[PDB]
Protein backbone atom coordinates (compact mmCIF):
# COMPACT_ATOMS: atom_id res chain seq x y z
CA UNK A 1 0.00 0.00 0.00
CA UNK A 2 0.97 3.61 -0.77
CA UNK A 3 3.79 2.96 -3.22
CA UNK A 4 5.84 5.95 -4.32
CA UNK A 5 8.06 6.84 -7.26
CA UNK A 6 9.86 10.15 -7.60
CA UNK A 7 7.35 12.71 -6.36
CA UNK A 8 4.03 10.88 -6.64
CA UNK A 9 2.13 8.50 -4.36
CA UNK A 10 -0.55 5.95 -5.28
CA UNK A 11 -2.29 3.84 -2.62
CA UNK A 12 -3.33 0.27 -3.48
CA UNK A 13 -4.14 -2.93 -1.56
CA UNK A 14 -3.76 -8.83 -7.62
CA UNK A 15 -1.42 -8.56 -10.60
CA UNK A 16 -1.19 -10.28 -13.98
CA UNK A 17 2.19 -10.01 -15.67
CA UNK A 18 2.97 -9.99 -19.40
CA UNK A 19 3.69 -13.28 -21.11
CA UNK A 20 5.48 -14.73 -18.10
CA UNK A 21 8.53 -12.46 -18.09
CA UNK A 22 9.46 -9.43 -16.03
CA UNK A 23 10.54 -6.12 -17.66
CA UNK A 24 16.10 9.79 -14.01
CA UNK A 25 13.09 11.90 -13.05
CA UNK A 26 10.86 9.95 -15.44
CA UNK A 27 9.98 7.22 -12.92
CA UNK A 28 6.73 8.74 -11.73
CA UNK A 29 3.10 7.67 -11.85
CA UNK A 30 1.55 9.62 -14.68
CA UNK A 31 -2.22 9.92 -14.51
CA UNK A 32 -4.42 10.50 -17.51
CA UNK A 33 -7.55 12.50 -16.87
CA UNK A 34 -10.42 10.23 -15.94
CA UNK A 35 -13.30 9.38 -18.25
CA UNK A 36 -16.94 8.84 -17.32
CA UNK A 37 -18.65 5.48 -17.74
CA UNK A 38 -22.33 5.97 -18.50
CA UNK A 39 -25.11 3.54 -19.39
CA UNK A 40 -24.81 3.92 -23.16
CA UNK A 41 -21.03 3.65 -23.39
CA UNK A 42 -19.06 1.59 -25.82
CA UNK A 43 -15.37 1.68 -24.96
CA UNK A 44 -12.18 3.71 -24.95
CA UNK A 45 -8.62 3.20 -26.12
CA UNK A 46 -5.25 4.88 -25.73
CA UNK A 47 -2.13 4.36 -27.80
CA UNK A 48 0.56 3.84 -25.26
CA UNK A 49 3.86 5.61 -26.17
CA UNK A 50 1.99 8.60 -27.59
CA UNK A 51 -0.21 9.48 -24.63
CA UNK A 52 2.88 9.93 -22.48
CA UNK A 53 4.83 11.92 -25.02
CA UNK A 54 2.64 14.98 -25.48
CA UNK A 55 2.58 15.85 -21.78
CA UNK A 56 5.35 14.47 -19.60
CA UNK A 57 9.04 15.00 -19.05
CA UNK A 58 9.15 11.47 -20.42
CA UNK A 59 7.97 13.23 -23.57
CA UNK A 60 10.73 15.77 -23.02
CA UNK A 61 13.07 12.78 -23.13
CA UNK A 62 11.31 11.75 -26.34
CA UNK A 63 11.87 14.94 -28.34
CA UNK A 64 15.56 15.05 -27.49
CA UNK A 65 16.06 11.29 -27.72
CA UNK A 66 13.90 9.55 -30.31
CA UNK A 67 14.86 5.89 -30.03
CA UNK A 68 14.33 4.11 -26.72
CA UNK A 69 13.44 0.95 -24.84
CA UNK A 70 10.67 1.11 -22.25
CA UNK A 71 8.67 -1.22 -20.03
CA UNK A 72 5.27 -0.24 -18.67
CA UNK A 73 2.95 -0.99 -15.81
CA UNK A 74 -0.68 0.11 -15.80
CA UNK A 75 -3.13 0.61 -12.94
CA UNK A 76 -6.82 0.91 -13.76
CA UNK A 77 -9.36 1.41 -11.01
CA UNK A 78 -12.94 2.64 -10.94
CA UNK A 79 -14.64 3.58 -7.68
CA UNK A 80 -18.32 2.75 -7.34
CA UNK A 81 -20.61 1.95 -4.45
CA UNK A 82 -22.19 -1.44 -3.81
CA UNK A 83 -25.37 -0.44 -5.64
CA UNK A 84 -23.93 -0.26 -9.16
CA UNK A 85 -23.57 -3.26 -11.44
CA UNK A 86 -21.65 -3.95 -14.61
CA UNK A 87 -18.53 -5.54 -15.99
CA UNK A 88 -15.46 -4.22 -17.77
CA UNK A 89 -12.65 -5.78 -19.75
CA UNK A 90 -9.16 -4.32 -19.45
CA UNK A 91 -6.86 -5.65 -22.16
CA UNK A 92 -3.54 -4.41 -23.54
CA UNK A 93 -3.10 -5.44 -27.17
CA UNK A 94 0.31 -5.16 -28.88
CA UNK A 95 0.50 -3.92 -32.48
CA UNK A 96 -3.10 -2.84 -32.93
CA UNK A 97 -3.30 -2.10 -36.64
CA UNK A 98 -6.74 -0.56 -36.93
CA UNK A 99 -8.66 -0.31 -40.18
CA UNK A 100 -10.11 2.67 -41.99
CA UNK A 101 -13.77 3.35 -42.60
CA UNK A 102 -13.13 4.17 -46.23
CA UNK A 103 -12.21 0.96 -48.00
CA UNK A 104 -9.28 2.27 -50.05
CA UNK A 105 -7.38 4.52 -47.63
CA UNK A 106 -5.74 4.39 -44.22
CA UNK A 107 -6.81 6.57 -41.26
CA UNK A 108 -5.04 9.82 -40.55
CA UNK A 109 -2.98 10.49 -37.46
CA UNK A 110 -5.40 12.50 -35.33
CA UNK A 111 -8.07 9.80 -35.51
CA UNK A 112 -5.89 6.93 -34.32
CA UNK A 113 -4.54 8.62 -31.21
CA UNK A 114 -5.63 11.60 -29.19
CA UNK A 115 -2.74 13.03 -27.23
CA UNK A 116 -3.48 11.71 -23.70
CA UNK A 117 -7.21 11.98 -24.43
CA UNK A 118 -9.32 8.88 -24.81
CA UNK A 119 -10.63 8.05 -28.24
CA UNK A 120 -14.05 6.47 -27.94
CA UNK A 121 -15.71 3.48 -29.57
CA UNK A 122 -19.26 3.29 -30.87
CA UNK A 123 -21.88 0.61 -31.39
CA UNK A 124 -22.89 1.48 -34.95
CA UNK A 125 -21.02 1.57 -38.19
CA UNK A 126 -19.46 4.79 -39.41
CA UNK A 127 -19.61 6.67 -42.66
CA UNK A 128 -17.22 5.86 -45.46
CA UNK A 129 -17.19 8.70 -47.99
CA UNK A 130 -16.25 11.42 -45.53
CA UNK A 131 -12.58 11.45 -44.52
CA UNK A 132 -9.94 9.18 -43.00
CA UNK A 133 -11.88 7.86 -40.02
CA UNK A 134 -11.27 4.75 -37.97
CA UNK A 135 -13.83 1.99 -38.47
CA UNK A 136 -14.96 1.82 -34.87
CA UNK A 137 -17.85 -0.63 -34.65
CA UNK A 138 -17.28 -2.20 -31.27
CA UNK A 139 -18.26 -5.82 -31.91
CA UNK A 140 -15.46 -6.14 -34.47
CA UNK A 141 -13.14 -4.19 -32.12
CA UNK A 142 -11.57 -2.11 -34.90
CA UNK A 143 -9.21 -4.87 -36.08
CA UNK A 144 -11.78 -6.97 -37.92
CA UNK A 145 -11.58 -9.66 -35.25
CA UNK A 146 -14.30 -11.16 -33.09
CA UNK A 147 -14.53 -9.24 -29.83
CA UNK A 148 -15.22 -12.41 -27.86
CA UNK A 149 -11.80 -13.81 -28.70
CA UNK A 150 -9.94 -10.81 -27.31
CA UNK A 151 -8.83 -12.53 -24.11
CA UNK A 152 -5.81 -14.21 -25.71
CA UNK A 153 -3.94 -10.97 -25.06
CA UNK A 154 -2.95 -10.17 -21.44
CA UNK A 155 -6.19 -9.13 -19.81
CA UNK A 156 -7.94 -8.73 -16.49
CA UNK A 157 -11.65 -8.64 -15.73
CA UNK A 158 -13.07 -5.76 -13.73
CA UNK A 159 -16.43 -6.80 -12.32
CA UNK A 160 -18.07 -4.34 -9.94
CA UNK A 161 -19.76 -7.08 -7.92
CA UNK A 162 -16.56 -8.34 -6.28
CA UNK A 163 -13.43 -6.90 -7.90
CA UNK A 164 -12.63 -3.21 -8.08
CA UNK A 165 -9.35 -2.62 -9.89
CA UNK A 166 -6.88 -4.06 -12.37
CA UNK A 167 -3.09 -3.90 -12.59
CA UNK A 168 -1.09 -4.95 -15.65
CA UNK A 169 2.63 -5.29 -16.33
CA UNK A 170 3.78 -5.32 -19.93
CA UNK A 171 7.31 -6.08 -21.14
CA UNK A 172 8.91 -4.60 -24.23
CA UNK A 173 7.54 -6.39 -27.28
CA UNK A 174 9.17 -5.34 -30.53
CA UNK A 175 11.08 -6.90 -33.39
CA UNK A 176 13.87 -4.34 -33.73
CA UNK A 177 15.67 -3.77 -30.40
CA UNK A 178 15.75 0.00 -31.02
CA UNK A 179 13.07 1.76 -33.06
CA UNK A 180 12.04 5.40 -33.40
CA UNK A 181 9.15 6.24 -31.14
CA UNK A 182 7.69 9.06 -33.21
CA UNK A 183 6.45 6.88 -36.07
CA UNK A 184 5.57 3.70 -34.16
CA UNK A 185 3.07 2.74 -31.45
CA UNK A 186 3.71 -0.72 -30.06
CA UNK A 187 1.08 -1.07 -27.33
CA UNK A 188 -2.61 -0.26 -27.12
CA UNK A 189 -4.77 -0.25 -24.00
CA UNK A 190 -8.44 -1.10 -24.58
CA UNK A 191 -11.31 -0.94 -22.09
CA UNK A 192 -14.59 -2.46 -23.30
CA UNK A 193 -17.75 -2.84 -21.20
CA UNK A 194 -19.57 -6.13 -21.76
CA UNK A 195 -22.38 -5.92 -19.19
CA UNK A 196 -23.47 -2.26 -19.30
CA UNK A 197 -23.67 -0.15 -16.19
CA UNK A 198 -27.06 -0.26 -14.50
CA UNK A 199 -28.34 1.42 -11.36
CA UNK A 200 -31.52 2.50 -9.63
CA UNK A 201 -33.00 5.97 -9.28
CA UNK A 202 -31.28 8.05 -6.63
CA UNK A 203 -27.71 6.94 -7.14
CA UNK A 204 -25.19 8.89 -9.17
CA UNK A 205 -25.51 8.13 -12.90
CA UNK A 206 -21.85 7.64 -13.85
CA UNK A 207 -18.76 5.85 -12.57
CA UNK A 208 -15.35 7.45 -13.18
CA UNK A 209 -12.43 5.40 -14.46
CA UNK A 210 -8.87 6.52 -13.74
CA UNK A 211 -5.87 5.22 -15.68
CA UNK A 212 -2.39 5.35 -14.15
CA UNK A 213 0.67 4.59 -16.28
CA UNK A 214 4.17 4.32 -14.93
CA UNK A 215 7.18 3.50 -17.12
CA UNK A 216 9.93 1.39 -15.61
CA UNK A 217 13.55 1.15 -16.86
CA UNK A 218 13.50 3.58 -19.78
CA UNK A 219 16.83 3.18 -21.57
CA UNK A 220 18.40 5.83 -23.78
Amino acid at each position, epitope marked *: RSITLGNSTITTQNVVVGYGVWPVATCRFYTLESVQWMKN*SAGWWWKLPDALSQMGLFGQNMQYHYLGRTGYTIHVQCNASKFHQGCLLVVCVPEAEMGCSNLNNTPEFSELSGGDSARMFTDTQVGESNAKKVQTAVWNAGMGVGVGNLTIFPHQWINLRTNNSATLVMPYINSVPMDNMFRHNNLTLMIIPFVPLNYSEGSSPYVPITVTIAPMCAEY
Partner: antibody
Amino acid sequence: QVQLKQSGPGLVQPSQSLSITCTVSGFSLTNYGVHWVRQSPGKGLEWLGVIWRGGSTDYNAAFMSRLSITKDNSKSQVFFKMNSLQADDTAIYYCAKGDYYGYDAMDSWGQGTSVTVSR
Amino acid sequence: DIQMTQSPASLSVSVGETVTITCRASENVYRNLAWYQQKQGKSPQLLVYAATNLADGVPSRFSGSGSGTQYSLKINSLQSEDFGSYFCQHFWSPVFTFGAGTKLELK
Protein backbone atom coordinates in the same frame (compact mmCIF):
# COMPACT_ATOMS: atom_id res chain seq x y z
CA GLN B 1 -18.64 24.72 -18.94
CA VAL B 2 -18.49 27.81 -21.17
CA GLN B 3 -19.39 26.89 -24.73
CA LEU B 4 -18.50 28.34 -28.11
CA LYS B 5 -19.62 31.76 -29.35
CA GLN B 6 -19.43 33.56 -32.67
CA SER B 7 -19.09 37.10 -33.98
CA GLY B 8 -20.30 38.17 -37.40
CA PRO B 9 -21.12 41.26 -39.46
CA GLY B 10 -24.89 40.85 -39.48
CA LEU B 11 -25.57 43.13 -42.45
CA VAL B 12 -24.22 42.58 -45.95
CA GLN B 13 -24.43 43.84 -49.58
CA PRO B 14 -25.91 41.61 -52.33
CA SER B 15 -23.43 39.53 -54.36
CA GLN B 16 -20.60 39.84 -51.84
CA SER B 17 -18.56 37.73 -49.42
CA LEU B 18 -19.41 36.94 -45.81
CA SER B 19 -17.05 36.35 -42.88
CA ILE B 20 -18.19 34.85 -39.57
CA THR B 21 -15.54 33.80 -37.05
CA CYS B 22 -16.61 31.31 -34.37
CA THR B 23 -14.88 31.54 -30.98
CA VAL B 24 -14.53 28.40 -28.87
CA SER B 25 -13.77 27.99 -25.17
CA GLY B 26 -12.70 25.11 -22.95
CA PHE B 27 -11.97 22.34 -25.46
CA SER B 28 -9.20 21.91 -28.00
CA LEU B 29 -9.42 21.67 -31.77
CA THR B 30 -7.44 18.46 -32.22
CA ASN B 31 -10.15 16.56 -30.32
CA TYR B 32 -13.25 18.06 -31.93
CA GLY B 33 -14.59 19.43 -35.18
CA VAL B 34 -17.12 22.20 -35.79
CA HIS B 35 -20.28 22.12 -37.88
CA TRP B 36 -21.83 24.89 -39.97
CA VAL B 37 -25.62 24.67 -40.20
CA ARG B 38 -27.88 27.23 -41.87
CA GLN B 39 -31.29 27.67 -40.25
CA SER B 40 -33.79 29.20 -42.67
CA PRO B 41 -37.56 29.76 -42.36
CA GLY B 42 -38.21 28.87 -46.00
CA LYS B 43 -35.84 26.03 -46.85
CA GLY B 44 -35.76 24.66 -43.31
CA LEU B 45 -32.55 23.33 -41.83
CA GLU B 46 -29.61 22.53 -44.07
CA TRP B 47 -26.02 21.50 -43.50
CA LEU B 48 -23.25 23.56 -45.09
CA GLY B 49 -19.87 22.09 -44.22
CA VAL B 50 -17.52 20.83 -41.55
CA ILE B 51 -13.84 20.76 -40.74
CA TRP B 52 -12.78 17.55 -39.05
CA ARG B 53 -10.33 17.22 -36.18
CA GLY B 54 -7.55 16.25 -38.58
CA GLY B 55 -7.83 19.39 -40.68
CA SER B 56 -9.77 17.95 -43.62
CA THR B 57 -12.94 19.71 -44.76
CA ASP B 58 -16.13 18.52 -46.43
CA TYR B 59 -18.68 20.83 -48.06
CA ASN B 60 -22.26 20.60 -49.24
CA ALA B 61 -22.83 19.73 -52.88
CA ALA B 62 -24.91 22.83 -53.67
CA PHE B 63 -22.25 25.19 -52.27
CA MET B 64 -19.04 23.67 -53.62
CA SER B 65 -17.82 26.87 -55.25
CA ARG B 66 -18.78 29.43 -52.59
CA LEU B 67 -17.32 27.96 -49.37
CA SER B 68 -13.85 27.97 -47.82
CA ILE B 69 -13.41 26.88 -44.19
CA THR B 70 -10.23 27.02 -42.10
CA LYS B 71 -9.20 27.11 -38.46
CA ASP B 72 -6.31 27.82 -36.11
CA ASN B 73 -5.43 25.37 -33.35
CA SER B 74 -3.56 27.48 -30.79
CA LYS B 75 -5.47 30.69 -31.45
CA SER B 76 -8.69 28.56 -31.29
CA GLN B 77 -11.05 30.11 -33.80
CA VAL B 78 -12.42 28.87 -37.10
CA PHE B 79 -12.90 30.97 -40.23
CA PHE B 80 -15.25 30.39 -43.13
CA LYS B 81 -16.10 32.56 -46.13
CA MET B 82 -19.43 32.29 -47.91
CA ASN B 83 -19.24 33.94 -51.33
CA SER B 84 -21.61 35.54 -53.87
CA LEU B 85 -24.28 35.98 -51.16
CA GLN B 86 -27.49 35.57 -53.11
CA ALA B 87 -31.04 36.55 -52.19
CA ASP B 88 -31.92 33.15 -50.69
CA ASP B 89 -29.38 33.61 -47.86
CA THR B 90 -31.87 35.44 -45.64
CA ALA B 91 -31.19 33.00 -42.82
CA ILE B 92 -29.60 32.71 -39.39
CA TYR B 93 -26.26 30.90 -39.37
CA TYR B 94 -25.31 28.54 -36.55
CA CYS B 95 -21.92 27.37 -35.27
CA ALA B 96 -21.95 24.03 -33.47
CA LYS B 97 -19.36 21.52 -32.29
CA GLY B 98 -19.58 17.83 -33.08
CA ASP B 99 -18.29 14.40 -31.99
CA TYR B 100 -20.54 14.02 -28.95
CA TYR B 101 -18.94 10.90 -27.41
CA GLY B 102 -17.46 10.22 -30.84
CA TYR B 103 -20.78 9.95 -32.67
CA ASP B 104 -20.79 12.89 -35.17
CA ALA B 105 -23.75 14.86 -33.85
CA MET B 106 -24.09 18.51 -32.89
CA ASP B 107 -23.78 18.74 -29.12
CA SER B 108 -23.76 22.46 -28.27
CA TRP B 109 -24.45 25.45 -30.47
CA GLY B 110 -23.58 29.09 -30.95
CA GLN B 111 -25.93 31.96 -30.26
CA GLY B 112 -26.77 32.42 -33.95
CA THR B 113 -26.34 35.63 -35.95
CA SER B 114 -29.10 36.29 -38.47
CA VAL B 115 -27.91 37.91 -41.69
CA THR B 116 -29.93 39.60 -44.42
CA VAL B 117 -28.80 40.09 -48.00
CA SER B 118 -30.74 43.26 -48.87
CA ARG B 119 -30.44 46.97 -48.29
CA ASP C 1 -28.93 11.30 -52.52
CA ILE C 2 -30.69 10.16 -49.34
CA GLN C 3 -33.78 12.05 -48.17
CA MET C 4 -35.46 12.29 -44.77
CA THR C 5 -39.24 12.67 -44.64
CA GLN C 6 -40.57 13.59 -41.20
CA SER C 7 -44.14 12.47 -40.53
CA PRO C 8 -46.73 13.70 -39.73
CA ALA C 9 -46.94 17.48 -40.11
CA SER C 10 -47.89 18.73 -36.64
CA LEU C 11 -49.64 17.64 -33.46
CA SER C 12 -51.71 19.32 -30.76
CA VAL C 13 -52.21 17.01 -27.78
CA SER C 14 -52.99 17.82 -24.14
CA VAL C 15 -50.52 17.51 -21.25
CA GLY C 16 -49.76 13.98 -20.12
CA GLU C 17 -50.46 11.79 -23.16
CA THR C 18 -48.36 9.22 -25.00
CA VAL C 19 -47.61 10.54 -28.48
CA THR C 20 -45.46 9.16 -31.28
CA ILE C 21 -43.44 10.65 -34.12
CA THR C 22 -41.56 9.01 -36.98
CA CYS C 23 -39.34 9.80 -39.93
CA ARG C 24 -38.22 7.75 -42.90
CA ALA C 25 -34.95 7.46 -44.79
CA SER C 26 -34.16 6.59 -48.40
CA GLU C 27 -31.54 3.86 -47.95
CA ASN C 28 -29.94 2.08 -45.00
CA VAL C 29 -28.34 4.30 -42.36
CA TYR C 30 -27.56 1.64 -39.69
CA ARG C 31 -29.04 3.61 -36.76
CA ASN C 32 -26.97 6.73 -37.45
CA LEU C 33 -29.78 9.07 -36.47
CA ALA C 34 -30.00 12.09 -34.20
CA TRP C 35 -33.08 13.83 -32.80
CA TYR C 36 -33.23 17.56 -32.13
CA GLN C 37 -35.64 19.90 -30.35
CA GLN C 38 -35.87 23.66 -30.84
CA LYS C 39 -38.24 25.92 -28.92
CA GLN C 40 -39.45 29.39 -29.95
CA GLY C 41 -36.34 31.17 -31.17
CA LYS C 42 -33.58 29.26 -29.38
CA SER C 43 -30.71 27.05 -30.39
CA PRO C 44 -31.67 23.37 -30.74
CA GLN C 45 -30.53 20.69 -28.34
CA LEU C 46 -29.66 17.03 -28.76
CA LEU C 47 -31.92 14.45 -27.13
CA VAL C 48 -31.39 11.04 -28.77
CA TYR C 49 -28.21 10.11 -30.59
CA ALA C 50 -27.90 6.81 -32.50
CA ALA C 51 -31.73 6.50 -32.33
CA THR C 52 -31.73 4.77 -28.90
CA ASN C 53 -29.32 6.57 -26.59
CA LEU C 54 -30.63 9.53 -24.62
CA ALA C 55 -28.53 12.60 -23.90
CA ASP C 56 -26.98 13.39 -20.53
CA GLY C 57 -29.50 15.85 -19.08
CA VAL C 58 -32.59 14.89 -21.07
CA PRO C 59 -35.22 13.18 -18.86
CA SER C 60 -36.41 9.61 -19.29
CA ARG C 61 -39.74 10.63 -20.84
CA PHE C 62 -38.32 10.56 -24.37
CA SER C 63 -37.58 7.27 -26.09
CA GLY C 64 -36.52 6.35 -29.59
CA SER C 65 -36.32 3.15 -31.62
CA GLY C 66 -35.98 1.79 -35.12
CA SER C 67 -33.39 0.14 -37.34
CA GLY C 68 -32.80 0.22 -41.07
CA THR C 69 -35.17 2.82 -42.49
CA GLN C 70 -38.29 3.15 -40.30
CA TYR C 71 -37.25 5.16 -37.25
CA SER C 72 -39.45 6.64 -34.55
CA LEU C 73 -39.47 8.57 -31.29
CA LYS C 74 -41.92 8.06 -28.43
CA ILE C 75 -42.94 10.52 -25.71
CA ASN C 76 -44.83 8.79 -22.91
CA SER C 77 -46.19 11.81 -21.00
CA LEU C 78 -46.20 15.42 -22.10
CA GLN C 79 -45.37 18.36 -19.86
CA SER C 80 -45.91 22.08 -20.30
CA GLU C 81 -42.26 22.62 -21.31
CA ASP C 82 -42.05 19.98 -24.06
CA PHE C 83 -43.60 21.83 -27.00
CA GLY C 84 -41.67 23.17 -29.97
CA SER C 85 -40.09 21.78 -33.12
CA TYR C 86 -38.63 18.32 -33.55
CA PHE C 87 -36.08 17.27 -36.16
CA CYS C 88 -34.54 13.95 -37.09
CA GLN C 89 -31.12 13.94 -38.71
CA HIS C 90 -29.02 11.22 -40.26
CA PHE C 91 -25.24 11.48 -40.13
CA TRP C 92 -24.37 8.53 -42.34
CA SER C 93 -22.55 10.14 -45.24
CA PRO C 94 -21.96 13.63 -46.61
CA VAL C 95 -24.19 15.28 -47.48
CA PHE C 96 -25.94 15.26 -44.09
CA THR C 97 -29.56 16.29 -44.49
CA PHE C 98 -32.27 16.93 -41.93
CA GLY C 99 -35.94 16.11 -41.73
CA ALA C 100 -38.76 18.51 -42.42
CA GLY C 101 -39.59 19.57 -38.87
CA THR C 102 -42.82 19.12 -36.92
CA LYS C 103 -44.53 21.17 -34.22
CA LEU C 104 -46.45 20.54 -31.00
CA GLU C 105 -49.06 23.15 -30.08
CA LEU C 106 -50.06 21.63 -26.69
CA LYS C 107 -53.67 22.77 -26.69
